[PDB]
Symmetry: C3
Subunit: 491 residues, 3 copies
């Protein structure tokens, strides 16, 4: 009672969280934050990216001009969304390397089309069918021109169209494969048929194939679709002795941030930077477990469902420096205004006060980690396909392998980051506790002794103002030294 006690300590909470570190799979800290985004709100937000809902139409069908897709003429998009309900309702067609055409168009992000005046002297234009009805009338693909004989003759065509512009031109055309020799004659007079379209730097030579195929909406014939790009100063050359499905012009082709995504999520009236096929997701977290397919500023896809980053010290209710969960037996749940602090006992009673500077020092370092990790995602736009509806073999094997490789490496980075950061967070918080203890010890000089549990026995009368002077660094040890020494070194 001619003495006082000053104890150094740290806070603790009743509701701790378990995190992983380098040396321990399960250790409890006072607080943590989730680094893996695991949920979507179920909608694709129409902002801030220009969304184009394909609805009943695939991109290709909108490109070709299926009457159902007339409203899509000359549209632009950041992201084209293909629905699973979609279907074609015009003339049956196939595209060799469909995926590549779909990709380059999607990446271009526009359906801007210019009509071109080709000299088709000698044939009947605007061919038409009952499988492709527009406004209740028999029609055809809006961007394609079906040619037939004129007066039972089909001369050889030798048509050119030069690109005298500053931009590339994208031409879409096709070859008809009638189901019967009868039809071949009826349409084109000739028995054979042959198409050759060229530029200075390419030749595409197609020979049509008469034959029956299983009927799609009761049609056994097919059209095969092809494309060719013509650059400034180059020229398109179309030769045909029949069966040519002609273009009515070219598509502009651009480069930018545009792409395409398969999803059934409804479009919402909302704003979100990151889009997945499950719907838009927040991008505050550095990682996500929602979908490997993303568009925009998105967290990186990892395999883990959860990864907790410690944002507080080790929770000890009741480190390398050995203070927290070391020589300090437990934390103080009763300390709610700081992370580290002082408890005392003197002649005037018992008290508790937080230390702000040490509290702030730990908090600043932890916020430093958060700033490196939170709200710093990276933009990706058109990528590769990551889900497949048909077996393809070699190329699909490679595409799958590349993505699986990427995911495991990022999943590794995420796991290690958290383990390392959490080990370091537990150690830096232990460190700040030790620094405060060490500083206090030096302040007291020869006037106190370390009891070994974070507490100092102060060998002199130390009232509330004295204790306060210790806590704010104005304690003058020389004032009490004589009193303390006599108390310390007696019998």
């Amino acid at each position: 009672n001619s003495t006082a006690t000053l104890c150094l300590g740290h806070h603790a909470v009743p509701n701790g969280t378990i995190v992983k570190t380098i040396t321990n799979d399960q250790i409890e800290v006072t607080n943590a934050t989730e680094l893996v985004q695991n949920s979507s709100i179920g909608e694709i937000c129409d902002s801030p990216h220009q969304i184009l809902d394909g609805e009943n139409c695939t991109l290709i069908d909108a490109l070709l001009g299926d009457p159902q897709c007339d409203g899509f003429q000359n549209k632009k998009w950041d992201l084209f969304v293909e629905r699973s309900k979609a279907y074609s309702n015009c003339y049956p067609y196939d595209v060799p390397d469909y995926a590549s055409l779909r990709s380059l168009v999607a990446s271009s992000g526009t359906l801007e089309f210019n009509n071109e005046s080709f000299n088709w002297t000698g044939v009947t234009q605007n061919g038409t069918s009952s499988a492709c009805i527009r406004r209740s009338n028999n029609s055809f693909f809006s961007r394609l021109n079906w040619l037939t004989h004129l007066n039972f003759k089909y001369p050889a065509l030798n048509v050119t169209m030069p690109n005298n512009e500053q931009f590339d031109k994208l031409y879409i055309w096709g070859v008809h494969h009638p189901g019967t020799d009868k039809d071949q004659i009826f349409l084109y007079a000739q028995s054979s048929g042959r198409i050759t379209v060229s530029t200075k730097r390419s030749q595409q030579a197609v020979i049509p194939n008469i034959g029956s195929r299983p009927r799609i909406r009761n049609i056994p014939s097919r059209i095969s679709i092809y494309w060719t790009i013509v650059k400034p100063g180059d020229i398109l050359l179309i030769n045909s002795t029949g069966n040519l499905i002609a273009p009515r012009g070219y598509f502009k082709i651009r480069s930018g941030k545009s792409s395409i995504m398969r999803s059934d999520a409804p479009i919402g009236k909302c704003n979100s930077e990151c889009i997945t096929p499950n719907g838009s997701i927040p991008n505050d977290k550095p990682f996500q477990n929602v979908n490997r397919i993303t568009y925009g500023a998105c967290p990186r896809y990892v395999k883990q469902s959860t990864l907790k980053l410690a944002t507080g010290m080790r929770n000890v209710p009741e480190g390398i420096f050995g203070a927290i969960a070391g020589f300090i037996e437990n934390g103080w749940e009763g300390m709610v205004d700081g992370w580290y602090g002082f408890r005392h006992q003197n002649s005037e009673g018992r008290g508790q006060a937080a230390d702000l500077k040490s509290t702030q020092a730990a908090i600043d370092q932890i916020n430093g980690k958060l700033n490196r990790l939170i709200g710093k995602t990276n933009e990706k736009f058109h990528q590769i396909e990551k889900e497949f509806s048909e077996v393809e073999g070699r190329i699909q094997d490679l595409e799958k392998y590349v993505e699986d490789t990427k995911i495991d490496l990022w999943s590794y980075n995420a796991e290690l980051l958290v383990a390392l950061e959490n080990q370091h967070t537990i150690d830096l918080t232990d460190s700040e506790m030790n620094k405060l203890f060490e500083k206090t010890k030096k302040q007291l000089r020869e006037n106190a002794e370390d009891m070994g549990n974070g507490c100092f026995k102060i060998y002199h009368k130390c009232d509330n103002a004295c204790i306060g002077s210790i806590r704010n660094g104005t304690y003058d040890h020389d004032v009490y030294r004589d009193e303390a020494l006599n108390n310390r070194f007696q019998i």
Copy 2:
């Protein structure tokens, strides 16, 4: 002699191991463990994966039905093993995109075949050759049906087969290329020949090519092999005016964990999760240097031949805290029952005792690292090919680049992991030593002084029970304080 000495210390071994850290390329620790698996037992274990030894047959030959491979009918596998000795002994064939067909079949993991009753009215079935002898008789591919003229005529075929099942069907067929017009007439009556097989969603149009090729086992003609997949509700349509090598049904196609591997390792009667072409390897280590080609739960392939993870403190015979290899001059090889401990000298003699708690604290942390690294490998099944027998160019360049990229990134992860873990292991062991020293110092209060080399000079008579009381935390400093103070502060 009115005094005692208590020294704090750590163990050391005569046989240390050199490891790498962040700051030092070569530092000696008491013990380490190897993280890179560098050897195989030379056999492929037949457990726990269903192994199928191709022996003399490639997967394709077993698929087609080379008589040599009759025993493989309807087999399933987790892993198909292709031998280098393998060879074909039927009709000479090629497969365009051989690699893709090989892959999809291998990935499917089954040769389950259902026979289908096609209406081949108008032709001769079960064509046969002297190049493909079965049971000493001239025969053909068991799954293929070679059609020829009936009564010197070959009408146009228009055969359909609908998929009215719940699963996909895999059809294998082929086109014959006779070496002579003479043979073309003899077999098919017609001079030309043409094959067209279709579904609702595809057309494969082949035009046979009469001509001579270098003779394979004395045959100058060839067959080209093709495949088509037919889904539920779709239909196969086969049109031919000759040369058609017909299917006798379909293969079931599955999806799962199946794959194929090229190896000459014998199959052993043993159990091992990880398979390489060199043979099975243990998967206790996180990394391996045996082969980039793996199947099953395998360690990851890295370029390093060795990577030592420290599992013990720095070995000092004769860290950031400066105790081990610091103010403590060297370790004690004579301490074999603990990592840290006490040596004393008093009136009753000289002694040594291990400290269990500090020893266990270091060991637990090191075992924590091991648990994160040991026995946690990840399963991979069908991947991409990683060795190539022919020059192919672009696609092979990409396949090689992808794998080389993956390997360097994992090799980087492995090198950094070990360097970081070892720096941390050396530091945590130094830390535990410092904690024990610090705790002991506080226990002694004013009764001892730090001699600066890990030893305390105790300023009072301290017999074996006294020393023991210090080592187990029951030392009451107040009992000796008067004696110690008088000895300390004298002239």
Copy 3:
């Protein structure tokens, strides 16, 4: 004045550098080094790699034998450099899968050509044109043999050439597509034309296409180029009924470290291991921001423009241990012969001296980090293409995705490495300061007291030799103990 003062401290500089750590985006250290190479000297050094400047010729043109490229016959290279100014000046040609042929040749690294004596009995050899003028004379591709009719007939050819060597043979050949039926007859007599070349393991069947294409240097006809590889014991078989552009032999095909690069950088007379299209770059740094396209021992491409690795302690003008920027208020700019040291005040004056051992300990650890990072780059040769002149779709998407994936992962590794190393460097330097302080404290025993700011109050007369004895570890505390104790414990 019956007392002395000894202060422990560290250096500081007027010109600090800002680096990144784990907990702080901007912290100042005494010195740092740049890890990202950001510049080129603008030239491609001709050493130590064998450089081949294509000049006006592409690799393919040098392969085929455009007269402009005659000087390139049988050349070898480590790296072939294609200029953008390059152009073809012979017969107009295309190569299907041009990129793959370009790649395999570049990777082979040689134009070594052996002439072979084919039996072309029945046709006219050495066909020639006005589009391909050699020495002012009409000529053709030096490695190709243009065949025409002899006496208005073109019989069927059935020529073989066996590989009875120990190495592979690379055959280059072509198919002519005349612009008119008139030309077809004039050259080959026959109206059709057909080419079939085979080995035991392959068939390439081409059917020429008569037709007009936009004129290249006033030629509307084209040649299509093809290749086939023939292995030891295999045989080439060439069948043609016209239009065959024949080979005059084979190219040797090798495997090794050869590749090709597109660049307009001039070749310099200098020595540098790493080549980019911007020019050669030094490879002392582990990372570079110059170009994703590299050849040789090169730093890895990252997205960051700068990454500073700390090579010195925290700069404090005027850590986890709390010494530097902690209880030691600031550094000493006046200390230029060491990183850590002593300042004293006694009866003889005031002094400063560096401590070498602690200085060297920090420096050695930092040099350890540098040795792991500096001058350890890895060799890469032929890779994949990373810039593209035409839209291609699927395969190009994959090639771009693979490279973008690789770059982000390395950029991540680089950012984390630096943040981790810098946090550790700041901590280890703080640690060495603390060790020196701790060691000094123990030396002084009961003869001094810690003033809490790195300074000791020494309670006895301590002249220059005494202070010196403290700095070099020969201070005998027992000599001054009586004097110090009486001064310490008085009233």
